[PDB]
Structures are given as structure tokens and as C-alpha cells.
Design an enzyme around this catalytic site. Structure first.
Site, mmCIF file in Angstrom:
data_model
loop_
_atom_site.group_PDB
_atom_site.id
_atom_site.type_symbol
_atom_site.label_atom_id
_atom_site.label_comp_id
_atom_site.label_asym_id
_atom_site.label_seq_id
_atom_site.Cartn_x
_atom_site.Cartn_y
_atom_site.Cartn_z
ATOM 1 N N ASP A 110 -7.409 5.622 -1.581
ATOM 2 C CA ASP A 110 -7.203 4.413 -0.817
ATOM 3 C C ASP A 110 -6.840 3.269 -1.763
ATOM 4 O O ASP A 110 -7.630 2.916 -2.647
ATOM 5 C CB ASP A 110 -8.489 4.126 -0.040
ATOM 6 N N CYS A 116 0.783 -1.249 0.000
ATOM 7 C CA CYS A 116 0.000 0.000 0.000
ATOM 8 C C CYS A 116 0.812 1.297 0.000
ATOM 9 O O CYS A 116 0.397 2.264 -0.629
ATOM 10 C CB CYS A 116 -1.078 0.021 1.089
ATOM 11 N N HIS A 124 -6.479 0.178 -0.895
ATOM 12 C CA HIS A 124 -6.849 -1.114 -0.310
ATOM 13 C C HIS A 124 -8.063 -1.772 -0.985
ATOM 14 O O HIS A 124 -9.076 -2.073 -0.348
ATOM 15 C CB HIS A 124 -6.989 -1.011 1.220
#
EC number: 3.4.22.-
Lengths: 312, 312
Positions: free
Chosen positions: A232, A53, A234
Site C-alpha cells: 500500500d 498511487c 498510501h
């Protein structure tokens, strides 16, 4: 209602310009976890899900700098059919294959040189160093990358880094990616740095910030009140490769979800600010804004000095 | 008839003077050069007056490459038909932009460290330069570790050198150039470090040390009594280019003079140790010798630790 929102040096009105805000956020290049790419190093991971990430966030910051360098901050991928050639070339640098200069493969490999095994999560200073090294391999863009140490940005060092000798018996300026790793508190961000942190996102040169807890890295692109807006990584998506026609589909590289927010006071104290200065005049302007908005605080978030601090 | 040490080999001063001399002349010697193609097109065509630390870096790295391919015992004088690696290693250091460790490439890489082409810089900066340039050498595929805060970290090194098997069959080890920048005093070397400094030159992995005052950089290769022995780049020679058969005249790259000496106590306190560990066992062996000879001191010259230091 109708609060003023800042995204990467651009302002949007929350209610009356909600659509403009949303399209500005979806126009940014979004890099998430991927799966089913070729195993990194042959026997390494075929997915960065669960560890990649911060690399993804580094990719998003770099891409934004590249987008601005070639296409400008006001460019959007939805406003025209015939895309400029630069767009596709930029995007393709970040595809999940070893032969692409800013791929997950190359970033993870470069991390090894920083003493991090392929598959390790690492923080903002490390990815900043990874980006600095990968830029050496990109002749097209030919970027200068400055990573501050000890919370201190040095003007003369940057100008030396960016000024290029004439080819023939005019000095050029290498477009500058400027990264400032910071520690804003022991366990939480200290309230004393909040206003100055916010000010960074209001600067035209702002590429936002890298941050987050281990395995929870986010790309912070702006703020509203006491909340930061972030992209993001994720979400695990399948590897997307170029088509026969040499182009790649960009669908999965733009986020059209509702923007995500978090309270600044919940942000991990370890961040890295990013700025892009295309020309010397841009860096000079950035210096003026920092001098005005950052250095005015008694407890300064970072330092900006003219001469390289002389060592004992 | 004292015992002389040169880069992990011992020589008897009187009884073995010829062997000592041959050992020293066998090292690759890089000096200032003139009349090469202007660096960056309009930059310097000679490095006289400024390039000396770059030359010492070249000498240290060349020694590592020679050892890697040919061995510590190999000498250009001992055979007529040279192994092909000899000219290939030498030509990496020609004063040409297309040579990966040229003066051109080193000075240009210095720009990324915030140093203008034509600036002298110290051992830590040239170490970072070497580390970046090694990224571009696919033949040698070296790991370059540059310690920070006088501390060498075992696990970081092993993560940097151990490479995943290419196929689903064993982990390779990248040959390691290990560089340790140190400041051994304020104006001169603290006498407490003298014995440990000497011990470094006795280890089989020793590439000696980079050192000297600004514009007075020397490549230290050994010692005798309280005198260091060094190679001196401060002679201006003419650019040597390749001949029609692809080889280069190598006469000016071997120093035939009497050994160059200076008292250790006159050494600039700012140095960088170099070591070469071709395989894991060489690195493990190096760790043992450091544990025995360096870490035993009440005041340690450097630290060697297993686990990457924790940070607040």
C-alpha cells in the site's frame, strides 16, 4: 489453520512459516507517496500525496522485476551485511529526482505523452505504457516491455521484441517485463475469473498485479484463500536522497507492517497482471503454465496465441 | 492550368509550373540507401526492399522540423549561406546509429513494436516509432500525437502540448506533430472520402500523408484533379556521410524529377494523415478547418472531439 499462502510465485505456510512469509513481504521494495521533493517540472507538485498511487504501484512492480533480474527471487536485504552493488543501483532508479530514470518526476512527465496532465491519477494500461517508454532510457537493464492489447498475448511478437541480433558476424534475449491489462467485469470481478487470477500469482514469473479504484491503487503480490495480499503506497513519507557516500538509506523502502489483505470480490475489475521472464526458457515456461492453468477455462481470462492476429 | 496543392500551398499548373517544381524539390527527400554500417552490427547494410515506410516517415517528420525552424516558405535554393538549422535537421536523418532519426534508430525502435529489423510495417507502426524517437530529441522537444479509433481528442492534445511554467513564468506550447492513421475502405479508398482527403492537403498545417501497399510506401504531398502527388523512396542511393567541415553533400536529398502522380482511387486504403501545429493558435486554427471541411461530411473521414470518450 496453516493455509498455504502464495507471494509472487513463492509459497509459504501460514502458521508454521509465518516468519518466512513476513520476511518475504518486507523484502519487497516498497514505494509510497513522498513529500518535499523538487517541484515536478519546476512549478508542479513537490508531493504526489493524493494522486501518485498508481505510479507508486508501477514502481513497485518494476523494481521487483529488476530485483529478480539481477539478484534473483530468493534474495533478501536482511540476510547479509555487504549488499550486492546492483541492489543500491536498482533502488536509486526510483528516487524522487528528475535525473533518476524511474522517478515520480519521469513517470509523471511520461504520463503527459499519454495525454495525462502532471498530477492526474491514471489506471493500469496508462502506467503500463509509461513503464514501456521509460525502459527505453535505461541502458543498464535494457528491458523489453510487452503490453498486451485486446486481452491477447502474442508469442511471435514477444520473441521478435526480445531476440537481439549478434554484435559480431549468438542471439541474445532481452529480459522481458510482460504486462497484461484486463477488465474482469463491469462493476465487480466476475467469479469465473477468480481461479485463473489466483493461478497467476502461483507462477514463478509472477510480478503480481496492478489494481484499485481511482486514487486507491494497490500492488497485489499474492493471496490466501479469497483474500489478496497487497503493498500500500498510501503513506506520505519525506523525500529520501543519497548520502555523500553515494548510497541511499533503504529503511523507508521496506514495509515491516502487518501485511494487508482484501477480498478479491471487492477489487476493482480493471487490473494489469505482471510477469518477468529473464531468459527465453522462462518465457517458454510461462507459456506452458498459461496454456495449462489459464486457457483451460471456458471463459478465458486472457488469450495466448502463437502468431500475430492478421488484420482484414 | 489547374490549381495544384502541395502541403498547404497552392500553385497554378501552367502559369506557375516553375514555382510548383521548386516547391516540390525544396522538400527533403529520403530514399533507400546502401553501404551504411550494418544495423545492430550484423543486420542489413541497405534498406532496399524493406525500408520504404521508414523513409516516408522520415520525409514527413523532416518537413515538420523544417517548418518548425525555418518555415513552410523556406527553400534551400533561395540563399547561398544556409541557416545552421538546415544541415542540423538533415543530419538527424543520416544512415548512422548516432543520428536520432536514422534508418538505424527507426528500425531498432520498430523492434519494440514487435517488428524485426528488416520488416516492412504500416503507417500506424511507423507513427508509434516516430513518437518514441521524438522522446530522445531534446533540441526539437516535439509533442507527437497519434490518434486511435479515427478520433482526435482536443483536451488530450492540449494536455500533451501545454507545459507548466519552469519558474514560479508562462505555459509554453510544445510544437505538435499530429498523426491520424485511417483505413478508408477494404481494398481501395471509398469514393465518399475523396473530397475530405483532398481538403487535408489544403490546410496550412498539412504534412500530407503516409501510405501505399506493403513495400510500396509513398509520401503524399498534394494533389491535382483526381491525382495525388508524392515523393518516392524506391531508388537506391549510396550512404552519404559528413565531410571534414561537418556538413553533408545535400544533392541526393532533393528530388529534381517531374512530379510523381497516381490516381486517388488507386491508393491503398491504409493511410496516416500528418499535420504540424507549431503553436496553440495553429492547433485551434486546424480544429476550425477540420470542423468546416471534414466534419461536415455525412460520412466523416475522422472525428475531432473535445472530451476523451467515456468507456464502460
Amino acid at each position: 489453520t496453516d493455509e498455504l499462502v502464495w507471494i509472487l510465485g513463492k509459497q509459504h505456510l501460514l502458521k508454521t512459516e509465518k516468519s518466512k512469509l513476513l520476511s518475504d513481504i518486507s523484502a519487497r521494495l516498497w514505494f509510497t507517496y513522498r513529500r518535499k521533493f523538487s517541484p515536478i517540472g519546476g512549478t508542479g507538485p513537490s508531493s504526489d500525496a493524493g494522486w501518485g498511487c498508481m505510479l507508486r504501484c508501477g514502481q513497485m512492480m518494476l523494481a521487483q522485476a529488476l530485483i529478480c533480474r539481477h539478484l534473483g527471487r530468493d534474495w533478501s536485504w536482511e540476510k547479509q551485511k555487504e549488499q550486492p552493488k546492483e541492489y543500491q543501483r536498482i533502488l536509486q532508479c526510483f528516487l524522487d529526482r528528475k535525473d533518476c530514470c524511474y522517478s515520480i518526476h519521469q513517470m509523471a512527465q511520461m504520463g503527459v505523452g499519454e495525454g495525462k496532465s502532471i498530477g492526474e491519477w491514471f489506471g493500469p494500461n496508462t502506467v503500463a505504457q509509461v513503464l514501456k517508454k521509460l525502459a527505453l532510457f535505461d541502458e543498464w537493464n535494457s528491458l523489453a516491455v510487452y503490453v498486451s492489447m485486446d486481452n491477447t498475448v502474442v508469442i511471435e511478437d514477444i520473441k521478435k521484441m526480445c531476440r537481439v541480433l549478434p554484435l559480431s558476424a549468438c542471439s541474445a534475449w532481452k529480459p522481458l517485463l510482460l504486462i497484461v491489462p484486463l477488465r474482469l467485469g463491469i462493476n465487480q470481478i466476475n467469479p469465473v475469473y477468480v481461479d485463473a487470477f489466483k493461478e497467476c500469482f502461483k507462477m514463478p514469473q509472477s510480478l503480481g498485479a496492478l489494481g484499485g479504484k481511482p486514487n486507491n491503487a494497490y500492488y497485489f503480490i499474492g493471496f490466501l484463500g479469497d483474500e489478496l495480499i497487497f503493498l500500500d503506497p498510501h503513506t506520505t513519507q519525506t523525500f529520501v536522497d543519497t548520502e555523500e557516500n553515494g548510497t541511499v538509506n533503504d529503511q523507508t523502502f521496506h514495509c515491516l507492517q502487518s501485511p494487508q489483505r482484501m477480498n478479491i470480490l471487492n477489487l476493482d475489475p480493471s487490473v494489469a497482471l505482471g510477469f518477468f521472464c529473464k531468459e527465453e526458457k522462462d518465457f517458454d515456461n510461462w507459456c506452458s503454465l498459461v496454456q495449462k492453468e489459464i486457457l483451460k477455462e471456458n471463459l478465458r481470462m486472457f488469450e495466448l496465441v502463437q502468431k500475430h492476429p492478421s488484420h482484414w
